[PDB]
């Protein structure tokens, strides 16, 4: 397995690009930044609103739980490769506690409101706006040979006045290398892709768009997560539950994957759910021909039939969108 699109960005780029080891770190001044508010939290950190008293811009300051110092350099290098491209989150200043020296990341600030708040809020069009804009965030990183690996809601910073939007955490985001096997204990459960779950290692950027398919049939539907699986077996299973087995064995045959025989018993024999059975009252108004067409595209098991971040953005679903711009 290769990706059909981007599979070369990282060998035709200078070893430097990529070598995220061959980073040395160049550290800033803790003092700049001033904790003013929490405003998130996490398995590996704890976010603050910030302050950086050189000249009272508000900021993010995301200070690191203890962290291994390789997985820092990553993030930190995905980061100053991807800053000031479209969408993606601009990293500020990198400083460190000058006693235990444990780093803080110093981000730029975003009014968010969060999704469980915000998204039912939203209209036909700012979802189709929204998932546009984080469509340039995937299209901008995946030309730059970055699968981000952890796309969800909660990584996705909305100002909603100012029409802004972020793709954050880019902690679990990893370079593309053709023929590499990645581990799949990545993603968060529920925008994890079926090749996370069957145990299909040398996937790439269609993974990224399996989670946006969640995180995208998840809004227009209602129902969030849209796949709620207890764990990772749960989570086959619901996806199984919707997308038929059919579709899956063949799946398994083109990448000749077993399943456990704990898996295959738990998986069983299900007919395909139509997406147009998960339009009820309350969603209706968000359901269209083209935002099924659309949302079928994404989520498919095959990683290879998804669509790419590019093919997505030209979807006759964006067409207002693209107009406006
Ligand atoms: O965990 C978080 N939470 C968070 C927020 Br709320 C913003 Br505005 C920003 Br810009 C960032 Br990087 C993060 N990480």
Known sequence: ??????????????????????????????????????????????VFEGINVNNNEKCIIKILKPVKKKKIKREIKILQNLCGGPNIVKLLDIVRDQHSKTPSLIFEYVNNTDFKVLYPTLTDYDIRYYIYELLKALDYCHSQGIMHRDVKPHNVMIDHELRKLRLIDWGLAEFYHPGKEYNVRVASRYFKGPELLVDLQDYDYSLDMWSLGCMFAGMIFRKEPFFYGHDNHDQLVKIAKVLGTDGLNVYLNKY??????????????????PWLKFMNADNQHLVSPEAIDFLDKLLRYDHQERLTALEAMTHPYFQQVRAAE
């Open 1 to 46: 397995s290769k990706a059909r699109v981007y599979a070369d960005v990282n060998v035709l780029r200078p070893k430097e690009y990529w070598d995220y080891e061959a980073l040395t770190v160049q550290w800033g001044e803790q003092d700049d930044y001033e904790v003013v508010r929490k405003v998130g939290r996490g398995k590996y950190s704890e």
């Open 256 to 273: 000749r994957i077993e399943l456990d025989p704990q898996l295959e018993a738990l998986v069983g024999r299900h007919s395909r759910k």
